Design a protein around this ligand. Structure first.
Ligand code: MOO
Ligand code: MOO
Lengths: 137, 138
């Protein structure tokens, strides 16, 4: 139980063996969503992040951007196309809920000034870097 | 308790605001002295019961930690922890920087290799990070 609003079960499919910071590939339990995640070398060993390892991905809401710009999405390490299902606008931040293709709901916290063109029903892309995710067992 | 976050600290919530979408909490760490500021969604603040007295674990991933020697940068950040670098591991793209904290703790930061060339073991530095870079776990 953590504050991260996006907690996705998945499985390690690959892991590199760089000495300071390593990357792993994760397939989500929906069986289609692939993610790239970076972790320190000590952590990859300590957690035993080898092919087939089941894990829980923790992606805090503010680490997720929501964009209508395909280049922004393509520049990021991870891209999850979807459809905005709900928008709650606060004074300083916005909660953007996005329906993923499988029906799950992604949550992003976006600065109010970056959500002015966003509206429910729009096709957008959720994006984040590999080093913005925590792996939990 | 088993997560990749290299920094995992016990703390007690000592304050919480009730802003609509994103709220902030003050967290007093295990040393009974260090206070952090953390941002969470309103839904999470209620779901987790992040009220005064609530004990939690702070998860801070290595790449979220900046290292500086500049007073302004440290003061401008939401959280800053002074320490001394105890070890550096240089890599082709990233460097692991470990910093000794009071009461035998070690903070771990992952810094891009081209930004850590002036960092060296034994320097007095300040680690810093945003309120919205921390995850709170029950
Ligand atoms: O820790 Mo949150 O509620 O994903 O911002
Ligand atoms: O090893 Mo990490 O980068 O603290 O998740």
């Amino acid at each position: 139980q953590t504050s991260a609003r996006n907690q996705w079960f998945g499985t390690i499919t690959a892991r590199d063996h760089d000495d300071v910071q390593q990357h792993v590939d994760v397939l989500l339990a929906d069986g289609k969503t692939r993610l790239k995640v970076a972790i320190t070398a000590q952590s990859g060993a300590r957690l035993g992040l080898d092919e087939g390892k089941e894990v829980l991905i923790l992606l805090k809401a503010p680490w997720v951007g929501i964009t209508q710009d395909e280049a922004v999405a393509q520049n990021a390490d991870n891209q999850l196309p979807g459809i905005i299902s709900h928008i709650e606008r606060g004074a300083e931040q916005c909660e953007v809920l996005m329906a993923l293709p499988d029906g799950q709901t992604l949550c992003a916290t976006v600065p109010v000034n970056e959500a002015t063109s966003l509206e429910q029903g729009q096709n957008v892309t959720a994006y984040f870097n590999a080093d913005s995710v925590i792996i939990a067992t």
